[PDB]
Amino acid sequence: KAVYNXATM
Amino acid sequence: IQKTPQIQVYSRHPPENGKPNILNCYVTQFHPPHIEIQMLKNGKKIPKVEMSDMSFSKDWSFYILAHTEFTPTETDTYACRVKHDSMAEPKTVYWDRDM
Amino acid sequence: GPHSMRYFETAVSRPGLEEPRYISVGYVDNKEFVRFDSDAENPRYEPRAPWMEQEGPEYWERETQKAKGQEQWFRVSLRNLLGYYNQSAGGSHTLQQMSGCDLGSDWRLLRGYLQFAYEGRDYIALNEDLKTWTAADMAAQITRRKWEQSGAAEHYKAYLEGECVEWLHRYLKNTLLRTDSPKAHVTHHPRTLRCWALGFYPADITLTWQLVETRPAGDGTFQKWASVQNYTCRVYHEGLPEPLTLR
Ligand SMILES: [Cl-]
């Protein structure tokens, strides 16, 4: 299952 | 940095006239991902070539595999033709049934 | 034996359109099983392996919706990176994320993976401890500082140790645990012998004498040769009782 990204760059 | 691709054309089995096979064209170590690949049978674009879904290696360079089922002829040539930003004009690599 | 899951995500912005193209490809034990393309019929997660279609509709409704979140996330960062590197508009730029978990022996976690690259160069990566970051350029020092105040590595470790290894199990339980082992020929042509190893799986093979990269053979198995009668060629592969020899 893919990962969900928190804070952007 | 932009990276020119790396073409390799090869067969699935050792070619023998009459026995079905797959012909591969493996292009790697390139960037940016936008790239065009066409496999040729005596200078003719092979109608429907199955291509892999593009992934990228550990060094982040992109790779993609173009293959087609085929049954070879000893008096027929097979080539792969690539067009990418890193090259002036397209690069063509032929099969070389020996090695 | 060793097991692994990986997700290679890529976002390419180009001078033509306004939204970049976002593609995600998943790999279980180095075979592609799920894909997401934003340039498609209706962008969604589709199974890329036969054993993976028996998943149920709720499964693809979450992954597709989570993929749509990632793509926005990539859209925002790319715009953020133009400023970080003082790039003006008019070019094409790539953002890449690699993420996954290496399992083992006991179906336990060995090493987590969370790393990003910009213009195909290393930009920031979660370390082995899953709690601290590594950032190459100064332009990424910014991101490290704000991901530290963000508690970002905490979320990612929770994933790598959480759903990553749990969901690796269930895919594995569902062709994969099989082993195709090489046919070995040698090309007897000169000006220089040449050893061939054809039709093997997986791709971890090794050839020596008394060079080209292991590559897919177009059907799910791999191929390799080594270039060089007092010489012998030895083959070493996982599915092998003992390494095979040929002169
Ligand atoms: Cl470089």
Residue numbers in the entry:
A (entry chain C): 1 to 9
B (entry chain B): 1 to 99
C (entry chain A): 1 to 174, 178 to 194, 200 to 218, 230 to 247, 255 to 273
The study reports:
Presentation of pathogen-derived epitopes by major histocompatibility complex I (MHC-I) can lead to the activation and expansion of specific CD8+ T cell clones, eventually resulting in the destruction of infected target cells. The interface surface that results from the combination of each peptide and MHC-I is key for recognition by the T cell receptor (TCR) on CD8+ T cells. It is well established that infection of C57/Bl6 mice with lymphocytic choriomeningitis virus (LCMV) induces robust CTL responses toward the immunodominant H-2Db-restricted epitope gp33 (KAVYNFATM).32−34 Upon CTL pressure, a limited number of mutations in gp33 emerge, with consistent patterns, allowing for viral escape from CD8+ T-cell recognition. Our analysis also revealed that H-2Db-restricted peptides, likely due to the presence of two heavy chain tryptophan residues, force peptide residue 6 to adopt a suboptimal backbone configuration as also previously observed in multiple crystal structures.
We therefore designed an l- to d-phenylalanine peptide variant for gp33, which resulted in the new APL F6f (KAVYNfATM, where the lower-case f indicates d-phenylalanine). At the same time our simulations in the context of H-2Db/pep and P14/H-2Db/pep complexes suggest that the l- to d-modified peptide F6f is compatible with the H-2Db loading and TCR P14 binding, even if with a slightly different geometry. To assess the molecular bases underlying the effects of the l- to d-substitution at peptide position 6 on TCR affinity, we determined the crystal structures of H-2Db/F6f and H-2Db/V3P_F6f to be 2.6 and 2.4 Å resolution, respectively. Starting from the backbone of peptide position 6, we observe that the phi and psi dihedral angles calculated from the determined crystal structures fall in the main minimum predicted by the corresponding MD simulations of H-2Db/F6f and P14/H-2Db/F6f. This minimum is slightly shifted with respect to the corresponding minimum in MD simulations performed on H-2Db/gp33, thus resulting in a slightly different conformation of peptide F6f compared to gp33. In H-2Db/F6f and H-2Db/V3P_F6f, both distances increase in comparison to the corresponding structures with the l-amino acid. As a result of the l- to d-symmetry, the side chain of p6f takes a different conformation in H-2Db/F6f compared to H-2Db/gp33. Interestingly, the aromatic ring of peptide residue p4Y, essential for recognition by the TCR P14, is profoundly affected by p6f and rotates clockwise from its conformation in gp33. Most importantly, SPR analyses revealed a 10-fold lower binding affinity of soluble P14 TCR to H-2Db/F6f compared to H-2Db/gp33 (70 and 6.3 μM, respectively).
